[PDB]
Amino acid sequence: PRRDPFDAARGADFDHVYSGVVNLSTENIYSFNYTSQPDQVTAVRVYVNSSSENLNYPVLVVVRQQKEVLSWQVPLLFQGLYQRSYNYQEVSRTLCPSEATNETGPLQQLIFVDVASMAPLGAQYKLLVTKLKHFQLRTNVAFHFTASPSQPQYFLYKFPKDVDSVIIKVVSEMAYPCSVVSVQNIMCPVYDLDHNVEFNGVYQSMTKKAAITLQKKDFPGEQFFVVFVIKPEDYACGGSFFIQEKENNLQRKKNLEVTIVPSIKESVYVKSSLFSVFIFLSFYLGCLLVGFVHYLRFQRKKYKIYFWNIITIAVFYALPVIQLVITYQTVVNVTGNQDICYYNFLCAHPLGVLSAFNNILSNLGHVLLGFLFLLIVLRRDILHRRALEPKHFGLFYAMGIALMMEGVLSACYHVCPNYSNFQFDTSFMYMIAGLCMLKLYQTRHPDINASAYSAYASFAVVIMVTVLGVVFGKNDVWFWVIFSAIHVLASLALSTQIYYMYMDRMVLLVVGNLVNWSFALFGLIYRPRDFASYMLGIFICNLLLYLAFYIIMKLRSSEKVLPVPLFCIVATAVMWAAALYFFFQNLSSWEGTPAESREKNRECILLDFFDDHDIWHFLSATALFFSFLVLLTLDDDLDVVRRDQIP
Amino acid sequence: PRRDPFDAARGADFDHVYSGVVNLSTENIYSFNYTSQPDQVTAVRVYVNSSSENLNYPVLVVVRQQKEVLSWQVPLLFQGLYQRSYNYQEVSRTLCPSEATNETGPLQQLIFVDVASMAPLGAQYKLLVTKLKHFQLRTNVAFHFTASPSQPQYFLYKFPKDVDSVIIKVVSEMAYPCSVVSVQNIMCPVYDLDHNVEFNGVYQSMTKKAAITLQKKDFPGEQFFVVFVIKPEDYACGGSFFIQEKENNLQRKKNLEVTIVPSIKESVYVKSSLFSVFIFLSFYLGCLLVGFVHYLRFQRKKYKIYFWNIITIAVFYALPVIQLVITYQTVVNVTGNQDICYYNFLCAHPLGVLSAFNNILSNLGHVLLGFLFLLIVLRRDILHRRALEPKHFGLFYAMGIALMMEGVLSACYHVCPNYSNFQFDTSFMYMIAGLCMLKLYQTRHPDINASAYSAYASFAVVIMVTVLGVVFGKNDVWFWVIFSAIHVLASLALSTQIYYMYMDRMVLLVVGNLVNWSFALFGLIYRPRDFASYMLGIFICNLLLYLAFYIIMKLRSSEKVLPVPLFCIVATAVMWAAALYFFFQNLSSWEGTPAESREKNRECILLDFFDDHDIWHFLSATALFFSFLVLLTLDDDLDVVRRDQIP
């Protein structure tokens, strides 16, 4: 079959609209011709319109270049998720460019476009081929564009000579439709279709925000393609059946803006590390200075098993989580799927094989303060033993160990946060609290009852509350039932505890009940995403509130408080308020899909390195340390009464 | 541009080879024509050869049907992983069929093939289009075929009326190349390329074996496509770069055989469940009968804290693993990626949202036997307390709790086994052993030393042995160093323990050292994949070995053993041998890639439901139960000596 393409190949012109009709006995061929100069990249874009009546007889389009062939049909057809189909009547595509070097010299390029159909009567089509003026992207310069499920887009970026790492930030003013942003290398072909985009490069699903960090050394040639693909449905991104506007003919157009910004320098790393270390070594320095001053001025003028048990439990609880997080990080590094970890992508600063180094270095406070508390408790125990030759020193040892373990477990969790890791850190605290409660109750012994066995019943209630939360997740009225039950249990347990230990008593009981009701109302306002964390927070706040009555009662002229006690109380209150402010700034969440979580990301404020969550870590560590110090040294004035004062 | 395809469209014939030459001013068009009858499926396959000299100027091939257009180029080009390129000079493709219904009636089908090129002089090509005689697959009938990286294959299967679930088994006689097997629905297009195969259906990577289970209710129309795609490199499947053969003329041909077999019926489920329950309720029945007989015949003629602590630790260790495994199972169900869990796919029988129901139901023995042991220990404790108004009853309570928790954790791990889960079950036993050892040493008190503090040093050594194993994985000489160090530590610890508690003493010490050296030699033969499990096994065998000397020494006429002791010991030896046989049959492994693990799968033997691993679970549970019973009731003759006999 001898056929000459040039016989009917109408030499066509760019930026010109060609209308036509084709059927079984007709085929249309257009020949486009251009030249590529050195040190310049030219991209060609093809556009085809066809009406909708061509359903059983679409129009087939073929594009031929020297080393590639591309093809498709109009109208494009998409399959839904529940047996639904969509059809699009406008298709566009960018042909993979081929740069020309100075050594190569200017290159002549030829392109062929063939339009055909098997319609019995005739199919109408419109065609338009153009060049792309804005194809290469610049640093720090925002660029706007529009994409469609049948008109994917992609652009080229070249690494500047000096820059070593960059961040791509993509922003839209509305979700629905939700799209995919991908980064790939220069070699053709470019995968820009729904079924092959997630195959080669690094990709993120997005609705309003996206941010990708890239390093130069991973890209031969120091350049890359950025591809944007829209999806036919919003199911994957937390959406229901695709939203259709009144105007829309089917089309889901998405307006996007993209920026590329250079990343920070290592000097920031050094400054942040030094600041983090010193801000907490200041505590050790101040304690040493105070001790030295006291020695210069004032001086001149049984639990071992209960410690080693905790050590063993901590170590053999910590190891497996470390291994699991290591596996998660390795998988995320290798596969390139950035929808596994719920980072705050706008302030995730990598180091080595670590994706978010700041989120882990922000946990030094827990470890250091726990170690300092353990040192203080050990010093007090040694002094007491020496003086004898102060009863629950094992409790304070457990407190310090729990603080250190919480720091370590949070550091492990932040390696790759998702909907599988919070439970470990949540549950270790429950285990420690249960062990401490059992030890305290056994040591105190029943004697009279003792009390009314309220603590064990409360701990059980917590047990099956957590079990139910694991079983039913936001299930109809079970959510409300469990919420109300837990709040009522907390209220009545607090009432019993206060009563078992006089108008002041009634006043305090009423205040506690009112505070519990306020907690219940706050929980009613915002639904609690996680039951265990909610219960832990309620328990902690109730503990501080009970300590509030204890201190107030002790301050009824019956006894006195030394400067260290009330200094610690004021510090604890101020730090608790400060940390509670940051506790409510959520930059991510595993409750929803990765795109919904990414919608909440934020840039970080302190020294260009730390976001809200790091500040929360610091403040929580400090507040817990000062609360523990208040608990330990509350009773010192009573030491005035000698002959075996209160233990 | 008016072009008439029929003017040069040479009406071509099937099963005929057409040779041709094309260049810039020439294009070849062939028209194929056929008819499709109702209740019959016809598939067309296209073949193109082109010599390798066409590197800069390949031959472009386009295939046009009524509602689809397909295109490609020859020679096909593949990009390697380390900047390597491959080219294939023979390409074949199957065109998506369109079934004809009786209501629709026979339909005439037309097809167009266009061959073009831009070579300045000319490019040679050979073309051949055929029908597929063997396209539909039959039940229980094996089918052989061959595939290539540039010649993917796929076939159609229709669900028989009676069958409700099927299994696809694919077998090859040699790995390298490694391929992907996918199952998709009827609706076209069919994704059979390297970059879009893993997008729609359910897929598995394979080298020698593959097995996929499917249920009818998930497929509208009760039919599906099975697709086989070969890969250009073996990196993903544990191999190196493309291994070139004498024939490789680049081509990596893979011969495959495929079978489709119906799945088992629910009667097997019922039988297996009933057998599993009754085989272990027999123990309860026998114990009850023996107790009743003894009562009829013979009769006629402090730890609470140590128990509740263990309960709390167990519960708050177990919960997070349950949540994690639930998440894993949900992800595997949704995504369809069957390379996440290392099941034994040849005997994985689903139920509900459970992929391998048998592997979990095979863990009833641990739970039931642990509960029975706890009941026995509680009965003995109650009897002793009543008689007083037997010193380490807390140890036996911990033993029973550990057995039950091991059963539960194994059940949790088998939901989705991979390289992230063994650590939890391995570490819980370490924690329990450490707690028990510490409590025993504290209760025994130092008195004289006590002993030489060897146990604590050994436990510490285990600590950093596990830490090093986590740090260095098969790292040069570190593997051998750690292996030898652990073996020497075990040997010298056993020597010290035996010496601290007379030629029999030296005889036993020499025997123990020889056994430890035998263990070291066995470890030398086969490299240990996991350090923690290896150490746990060594410790367990050393414990049984020590119990062996203890019983033998007691049997030197110094004391006597009642029938229950020696019956239990014989049962323990028999069951240990039986279970140790099955322990060495590994049907899967997470050390290598999923394909390598799948190479080891096996069908299951007992009642068509249980493989080797289930038998191992049963036997290990029984052996551990009988060993614990031997330990508890070893010292009963010493009861003859009254006035506070040995506790």
Ligand SMILES: CCCCCCCCCCCCC/C=C\[C@@H](O)[C@H](CO)NC(=O)CCCCCCC
């Ligand atoms: C009973 C004897 C002593 C037991 C000591 C161990 C148990 C008490 C808690 C110890 C400290 C663990 C950290 C607590 C809370 C936070 O870190 C986390 C937030 O990630 N959970 C949260 O829920 C956030 C904190 C909520 C704060 C509420 C308002 C103060």
Ligand SMILES: CCCCCCCCCCCCC/C=C\[C@@H](O)[C@H](CO)NC(=O)CCCCCCC
């Ligand atoms: C010290 C006082 C009593 C402490 C009681 C708790 C600690 C001892 C072990 C308790 C039973 C746990 C089960 C042990 C082993 C096996 O289940 C697993 C196999 O998956 N590990 C394996 O390594 C396989 C078993 C290896 C067997 C070696 C040959 C007998």
Ligand SMILES: *[C@@H]1O[C@H](CO)[C@@H](O[C@@H]2O[C@H](CO)[C@@H](O)[C@H](O)[C@H]2NC(C)=O)[C@H](O)[C@H]1NC(C)=O
């Ligand atoms: C639709 O197909 C019909 C026949 O299959 C075409 O009819 C002839 O097409 C040739 C090719 O252009 C013309 O030279 C003849 O003049 C046509 N016949 C008549 C009676 O007009 C028809 O041209 C096709 N449609 C279009 C738009 O070309």
Ligand SMILES: *[C@@H]1O[C@H](CO)[C@@H](O[C@@H]2O[C@H](CO)[C@@H](O)[C@H](O)[C@H]2NC(C)=O)[C@H](O)[C@H]1NC(C)=O
């Ligand atoms: C294809 O259809 C689209 C939409 O119907 C056309 O887009 C219009 O283009 C004109 C300029 O010629 C604009 O003034 C309109 O606002 C556009 N409509 C939109 C964006 O909805 C397009 O011109 C048609 N032709 C081709 C070759 O694509």
Ligand SMILES: *[C@@H]1O[C@H](CO)[C@@H](O[C@@H]2O[C@H](CO)[C@@H](O)[C@H](O)[C@H]2NC(C)=O)[C@H](O)[C@H]1NC(C)=O
């Ligand atoms: C390769 O291209 C050349 C020119 O571009 C072709 O030369 C002419 O091709 C036409 C097409 O059939 C013939 O009618 C002429 O007779 C050819 N010229 C001569 C001098 O023979 C050439 O045919 C192309 N290659 C092939 C195999 O057709």
Ligand SMILES: *[C@@H]1O[C@H](CO)[C@@H](O[C@@H]2O[C@H](CO)[C@@H](O)[C@H](O)[C@H]2NC(C)=O)[C@H](O)[C@H]1NC(C)=O
């Ligand atoms: C393309 O090349 C292949 C291999 O070079 C050809 O396959 C041969 O086919 C003949 C039958 O015509 C067999 O006798 C040979 O054994 C095959 N060689 C193999 C399998 O290596 C094929 O015929 C060529 N032609 C086409 C159209 O594919």
Ligand SMILES: CC(C)CCC[C@@H](C)[C@H]1CC[C@H]2[C@@H]3CC=C4C[C@@H](O)CC[C@]4(C)[C@H]3CC[C@]12C
């Ligand atoms: C190759 C480039 C990125 C190197 C730039 C220097 C960076 C990576 C170095 C400079 C100082 C270093 C820190 C110095 C001290 C500490 C405290 C220690 O407890 C953990 C490591 C940590 C936090 C180091 C992390 C890495 C660090 C921040």
Ligand SMILES: CC(C)CCC[C@@H](C)[C@H]1CC[C@H]2[C@@H]3CC=C4C[C@@H](O)CC[C@]4(C)[C@H]3CC[C@]12C
């Ligand atoms: C035996 C008992 C009384 C010991 C009590 C612990 C004492 C030494 C602790 C409790 C609270 C501590 C202080 C808490 C906070 C700060 C602020 C810091 O910028 C300097 C150190 C300084 C001022 C600490 C010094 C040591 C301190 C006073």
Ligand SMILES: CC(C)CCC[C@@H](C)[C@H]1CC[C@H]2[C@@H]3CC=C4C[C@@H](O)CC[C@]4(C)[C@H]3CC[C@]12C
């Ligand atoms: C009590 C004190 C000493 C505990 C200190 C624990 C610190 C050193 C541990 C806890 C969790 C650890 C991280 C866990 C996982 C990974 C991922 C791996 O790919 C690189 C190392 C990295 C990032 C670890 C670095 C060290 C780490 C932060």
Ligand SMILES: CC(C)CCC[C@@H](C)[C@H]1CC[C@H]2[C@@H]3CC=C4C[C@@H](O)CC[C@]4(C)[C@H]3CC[C@]12C
């Ligand atoms: C003692 C402790 C460890 C026991 C814990 C048992 C819990 C975790 C078990 C018991 C029954 C289980 C449920 C049984 C059935 C279903 C329905 C299924 O569609 C989803 C899983 C779900 C909801 C299971 C989740 C886990 C579950 C709630």
Ligand SMILES: CC(C)CCC[C@@H](C)[C@H]1CC[C@H]2[C@@H]3CC=C4C[C@@H](O)CC[C@]4(C)[C@H]3CC[C@]12C
């Ligand atoms: C939301 C889930 C996932 C985790 C967090 C739950 C817990 C920790 C939250 C939810 C309800 C919260 C409390 C609601 C109301 C009050 C009263 C206010 O005057 C101080 C803060 C305080 C005391 C909050 C502290 C934090 C809290 C206890």
Ligand SMILES: CC(C)CCC[C@@H](C)[C@H]1CC[C@H]2[C@@H]3CC=C4C[C@@H](O)CC[C@]4(C)[C@H]3CC[C@]12C
């Ligand atoms: C230990 C506690 C009770 C001491 C007092 C803490 C007080 C001051 C805390 C608890 C709840 C906190 C508020 C919680 C939420 C908001 C809304 C936010 O848009 C601004 C901060 C603001 C307004 C916080 C300010 C500080 C706050 C009022």
Ligand SMILES: CC(C)CCC[C@@H](C)[C@H]1CC[C@H]2[C@@H]3CC=C4C[C@@H](O)CC[C@]4(C)[C@H]3CC[C@]12C
């Ligand atoms: C809808 C089809 C698949 C139903 C077929 C019946 C199957 C699913 C039924 C029949 C008997 C059932 C078993 C009966 C008793 C037990 C013991 C219990 O401790 C766990 C559940 C378990 C193991 C059941 C699992 C489900 C089971 C095996």
Ligand SMILES: CC(C)CCC[C@@H](C)[C@H]1CC[C@H]2[C@@H]3CC=C4C[C@@H](O)CC[C@]4(C)[C@H]3CC[C@]12C
């Ligand atoms: C108070 C002390 C001495 C009680 C010791 C426990 C006794 C009752 C236990 C120890 C070993 C047990 C036996 C172990 C195995 C079997 C085989 C089974 O097919 C029937 C029950 C039978 C025969 C058990 C009966 C109960 C048994 C004899």
Ligand SMILES: CC(C)CCC[C@@H](C)[C@H]1CC[C@H]2[C@@H]3CC=C4C[C@@H](O)CC[C@]4(C)[C@H]3CC[C@]12C
């Ligand atoms: C001490 C005894 C009572 C403990 C019994 C534990 C049993 C009931 C628990 C332990 C682990 C659990 C499984 C863990 C995870 C899943 C996956 C989920 O999608 C369906 C339920 C299923 C398959 C659970 C079924 C119930 C289960 C097997």
Ligand SMILES: CC(C)CCC[C@@H](C)[C@H]1CC[C@H]2[C@@H]3CC=C4C[C@@H](O)CC[C@]4(C)[C@H]3CC[C@]12C
């Ligand atoms: C809410 C949704 C978006 C959360 C998504 C979490 C899913 C995708 C995560 C959670 C656990 C992850 C798996 C954890 C471990 C393995 C085993 C490894 O050999 C390959 C990766 C693989 C298989 C991971 C793939 C991604 C994974 C399945």
